[PDB]
Amino acid sequence: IRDDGYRLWGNRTLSSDSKWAFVTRVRTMDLVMDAILAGHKWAVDRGITKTYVKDVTEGLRAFMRDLKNQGAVINFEVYADPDLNSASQLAQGKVYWNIRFTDVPPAENPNFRVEVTDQWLTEVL
Amino acid sequence: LKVQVNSAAQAVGKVAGDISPTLAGVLPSWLLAPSATPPSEAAASLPH
């Protein structure tokens, strides 16, 4: 856009959903959930004992709070799935965890409601 | 000597002109231009 070559301009992706409109909604979807895996590559072995479901449910909580403190997300929650986890499919190898995080919005349109006063109100009008 | 040699240098320049002062130090409009984007400190997750 500006100065004929100086800067790019625009962040929304070709998406039909308004939930996935930004690229930062899409990039932080995939680049935390492959950064979750990098470091937690031990989650495909070390078979399901009593501490194993408990080992990674604050293995992710301690890694995603590192994402929260560096600004990559805002506040989250990581917890094991209560209802879908069962012993019928734990012997199959399937065991579920629920991740819920919200990410930072990009300030593509900052509004500025300017208002003036002296102590509490507009003294002139 | 400022008369005769200058008349001789004007005579040489009429017969064989000088080479053009070619330009090799032509830069773009960047090397004296500040990066106006804010640094990574201003976008950090810490109130300043």
Side-chain angles (χ1 to χ4, degrees), chain B residues 28-45:
Chain B
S29 65
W30 295 345
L31 298 176
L32 282 78
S35 295
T37 180
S40 65
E41 295 175 352
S45 66

PDB file of all heavy atoms in Angstrom, chain B residues 28-45:
ATOM      1  N   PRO B  28      20.092   3.141  -3.572  1.00  0.00           N
ATOM      2  CA  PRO B  28      18.643   3.329  -3.451  1.00  0.00           C
ATOM      3  C   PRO B  28      18.312   4.277  -2.302  1.00  0.00           C
ATOM      4  O   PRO B  28      19.185   4.856  -1.660  1.00  0.00           O
ATOM      5  CB  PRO B  28      18.123   1.914  -3.188  1.00  0.00           C
ATOM      6  CG  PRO B  28      19.271   1.192  -2.607  1.00  0.00           C
ATOM      7  CD  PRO B  28      20.481   1.749  -3.283  1.00  0.00           C
ATOM      8  N   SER B  29      17.017   4.414  -2.035  1.00  0.00           N
ATOM      9  CA  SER B  29      16.514   5.358  -1.041  1.00  0.00           C
ATOM     10  C   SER B  29      16.307   4.699   0.316  1.00  0.00           C
ATOM     11  O   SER B  29      15.377   5.037   1.052  1.00  0.00           O
ATOM     12  CB  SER B  29      15.218   5.992  -1.533  1.00  0.00           C
ATOM     13  OG  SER B  29      14.198   5.020  -1.656  1.00  0.00           O
ATOM     14  N   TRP B  30      17.165   3.747   0.667  1.00  0.00           N
ATOM     15  CA  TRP B  30      17.030   2.943   1.875  1.00  0.00           C
ATOM     16  C   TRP B  30      18.155   3.149   2.866  1.00  0.00           C
ATOM     17  O   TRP B  30      17.904   3.203   4.072  1.00  0.00           O
ATOM     18  CB  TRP B  30      17.007   1.466   1.519  1.00  0.00           C
ATOM     19  CG  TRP B  30      15.864   1.056   0.727  1.00  0.00           C
ATOM     20  CD1 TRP B  30      14.710   1.748   0.513  1.00  0.00           C
ATOM     21  CD2 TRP B  30      15.764  -0.142  -0.025  1.00  0.00           C
ATOM     22  NE1 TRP B  30      13.884   1.034  -0.313  1.00  0.00           N
ATOM     23  CE2 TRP B  30      14.514  -0.132  -0.658  1.00  0.00           C
ATOM     24  CE3 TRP B  30      16.613  -1.236  -0.215  1.00  0.00           C
ATOM     25  CZ2 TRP B  30      14.089  -1.173  -1.461  1.00  0.00           C
ATOM     26  CZ3 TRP B  30      16.190  -2.265  -1.019  1.00  0.00           C
ATOM     27  CH2 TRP B  30      14.940  -2.223  -1.636  1.00  0.00           C
ATOM     28  N   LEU B  31      19.396   3.227   2.378  1.00  0.00           N
ATOM     29  CA  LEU B  31      20.572   3.217   3.238  1.00  0.00           C
ATOM     30  C   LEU B  31      20.662   4.460   4.108  1.00  0.00           C
ATOM     31  O   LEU B  31      21.315   4.424   5.157  1.00  0.00           O
ATOM     32  CB  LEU B  31      21.829   3.076   2.383  1.00  0.00           C
ATOM     33  CG  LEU B  31      21.888   1.774   1.584  1.00  0.00           C
ATOM     34  CD1 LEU B  31      23.106   1.759   0.687  1.00  0.00           C
ATOM     35  CD2 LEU B  31      21.886   0.577   2.513  1.00  0.00           C
ATOM     36  N   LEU B  32      20.024   5.550   3.696  1.00  0.00           N
ATOM     37  CA  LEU B  32      19.692   6.656   4.584  1.00  0.00           C
ATOM     38  C   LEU B  32      18.169   6.727   4.589  1.00  0.00           C
ATOM     39  O   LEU B  32      17.570   7.489   3.831  1.00  0.00           O
ATOM     40  CB  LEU B  32      20.348   7.993   4.132  1.00  0.00           C
ATOM     41  CG  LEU B  32      21.842   8.191   4.442  1.00  0.00           C
ATOM     42  CD1 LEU B  32      22.766   7.439   3.475  1.00  0.00           C
ATOM     43  CD2 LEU B  32      22.217   9.667   4.504  1.00  0.00           C
ATOM     44  N   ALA B  33      17.551   5.885   5.427  1.00  0.00           N
ATOM     45  CA  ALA B  33      16.121   5.845   5.725  1.00  0.00           C
ATOM     46  C   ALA B  33      15.916   5.005   6.978  1.00  0.00           C
ATOM     47  O   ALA B  33      16.364   3.853   7.024  1.00  0.00           O
ATOM     48  CB  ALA B  33      15.313   5.263   4.564  1.00  0.00           C
ATOM     49  N   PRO B  34      15.252   5.524   8.006  1.00  0.00           N
ATOM     50  CA  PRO B  34      15.088   4.745   9.237  1.00  0.00           C
ATOM     51  C   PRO B  34      13.947   3.749   9.125  1.00  0.00           C
ATOM     52  O   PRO B  34      12.925   4.009   8.485  1.00  0.00           O
ATOM     53  CB  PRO B  34      14.789   5.817  10.291  1.00  0.00           C
ATOM     54  CG  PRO B  34      14.129   6.904   9.523  1.00  0.00           C
ATOM     55  CD  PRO B  34      14.773   6.907   8.164  1.00  0.00           C
ATOM     56  N   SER B  35      14.134   2.592   9.751  1.00  0.00           N
ATOM     57  CA  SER B  35      13.065   1.605   9.840  1.00  0.00           C
ATOM     58  C   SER B  35      12.029   2.101  10.840  1.00  0.00           C
ATOM     59  O   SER B  35      12.233   2.014  12.055  1.00  0.00           O
ATOM     60  CB  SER B  35      13.622   0.245  10.248  1.00  0.00           C
ATOM     61  OG  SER B  35      14.483  -0.273   9.248  1.00  0.00           O
ATOM     62  N   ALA B  36      10.916   2.625  10.326  1.00  0.00           N
ATOM     63  CA  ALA B  36       9.905   3.266  11.156  1.00  0.00           C
ATOM     64  C   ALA B  36       9.005   2.280  11.886  1.00  0.00           C
ATOM     65  O   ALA B  36       8.141   2.714  12.654  1.00  0.00           O
ATOM     66  CB  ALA B  36       9.049   4.203  10.304  1.00  0.00           C
ATOM     67  N   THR B  37       9.175   0.983  11.663  1.00  0.00           N
ATOM     68  CA  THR B  37       8.389  -0.001  12.387  1.00  0.00           C
ATOM     69  C   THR B  37       8.870  -0.088  13.838  1.00  0.00           C
ATOM     70  O   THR B  37      10.063   0.082  14.110  1.00  0.00           O
ATOM     71  CB  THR B  37       8.471  -1.366  11.686  1.00  0.00           C
ATOM     72  OG1 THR B  37       7.700  -2.339  12.402  1.00  0.00           O
ATOM     73  CG2 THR B  37       9.912  -1.848  11.522  1.00  0.00           C
ATOM     74  N   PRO B  38       7.958  -0.280  14.796  1.00  0.00           N
ATOM     75  CA  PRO B  38       8.383  -0.377  16.188  1.00  0.00           C
ATOM     76  C   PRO B  38       9.102  -1.682  16.438  1.00  0.00           C
ATOM     77  O   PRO B  38       8.861  -2.686  15.742  1.00  0.00           O
ATOM     78  CB  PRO B  38       7.054  -0.306  16.964  1.00  0.00           C
ATOM     79  CG  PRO B  38       6.054  -0.796  16.018  1.00  0.00           C
ATOM     80  CD  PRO B  38       6.494  -0.329  14.668  1.00  0.00           C
ATOM     81  N   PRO B  39      10.008  -1.729  17.410  1.00  0.00           N
ATOM     82  CA  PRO B  39      10.790  -2.940  17.654  1.00  0.00           C
ATOM     83  C   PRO B  39       9.956  -3.995  18.374  1.00  0.00           C
ATOM     84  O   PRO B  39       8.789  -3.792  18.704  1.00  0.00           O
ATOM     85  CB  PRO B  39      11.938  -2.444  18.527  1.00  0.00           C
ATOM     86  CG  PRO B  39      11.371  -1.284  19.246  1.00  0.00           C
ATOM     87  CD  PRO B  39      10.429  -0.623  18.291  1.00  0.00           C
ATOM     88  N   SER B  40      10.593  -5.139  18.629  1.00  0.00           N
ATOM     89  CA  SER B  40       9.936  -6.229  19.339  1.00  0.00           C
ATOM     90  C   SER B  40       9.737  -5.927  20.816  1.00  0.00           C
ATOM     91  O   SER B  40       8.977  -6.638  21.480  1.00  0.00           O
ATOM     92  CB  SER B  40      10.745  -7.514  19.180  1.00  0.00           C
ATOM     93  OG  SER B  40      12.013  -7.390  19.797  1.00  0.00           O
ATOM     94  N   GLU B  41      10.412  -4.903  21.344  1.00  0.00           N
ATOM     95  CA  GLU B  41      10.221  -4.516  22.735  1.00  0.00           C
ATOM     96  C   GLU B  41       8.853  -3.886  22.948  1.00  0.00           C
ATOM     97  O   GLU B  41       8.196  -4.148  23.961  1.00  0.00           O
ATOM     98  CB  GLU B  41      11.327  -3.552  23.153  1.00  0.00           C
ATOM     99  CG  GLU B  41      12.710  -4.174  23.146  1.00  0.00           C
ATOM    100  CD  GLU B  41      13.804  -3.171  23.455  1.00  0.00           C
ATOM    101  OE1 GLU B  41      13.499  -1.962  23.533  1.00  0.00           O
ATOM    102  OE2 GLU B  41      14.968  -3.591  23.622  1.00  0.00           O
ATOM    103  N   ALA B  42       8.396  -3.072  21.992  1.00  0.00           N
ATOM    104  CA  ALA B  42       7.117  -2.387  22.129  1.00  0.00           C
ATOM    105  C   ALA B  42       5.929  -3.325  21.980  1.00  0.00           C
ATOM    106  O   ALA B  42       4.827  -2.978  22.413  1.00  0.00           O
ATOM    107  CB  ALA B  42       7.011  -1.263  21.100  1.00  0.00           C
ATOM    108  N   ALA B  43       6.123  -4.495  21.379  1.00  0.00           N
ATOM    109  CA  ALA B  43       5.065  -5.480  21.222  1.00  0.00           C
ATOM    110  C   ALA B  43       5.150  -6.598  22.246  1.00  0.00           C
ATOM    111  O   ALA B  43       4.425  -7.588  22.124  1.00  0.00           O
ATOM    112  CB  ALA B  43       5.102  -6.073  19.815  1.00  0.00           C
ATOM    113  N   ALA B  44       6.015  -6.468  23.249  1.00  0.00           N
ATOM    114  CA  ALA B  44       6.215  -7.529  24.222  1.00  0.00           C
ATOM    115  C   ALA B  44       5.019  -7.631  25.166  1.00  0.00           C
ATOM    116  O   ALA B  44       4.145  -6.763  25.209  1.00  0.00           O
ATOM    117  CB  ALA B  44       7.497  -7.288  25.017  1.00  0.00           C
ATOM    118  N   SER B  45       4.981  -8.720  25.923  1.00  0.00           N
ATOM    119  CA  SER B  45       3.923  -8.939  26.908  1.00  0.00           C
ATOM    120  C   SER B  45       4.332  -8.443  28.289  1.00  0.00           C
ATOM    121  O   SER B  45       4.261  -9.169  29.276  1.00  0.00           O
ATOM    122  CB  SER B  45       3.558 -10.414  26.953  1.00  0.00           C
ATOM    123  OG  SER B  45       4.644 -11.180  27.442  1.00  0.00           O
TER     124      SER B  45
END
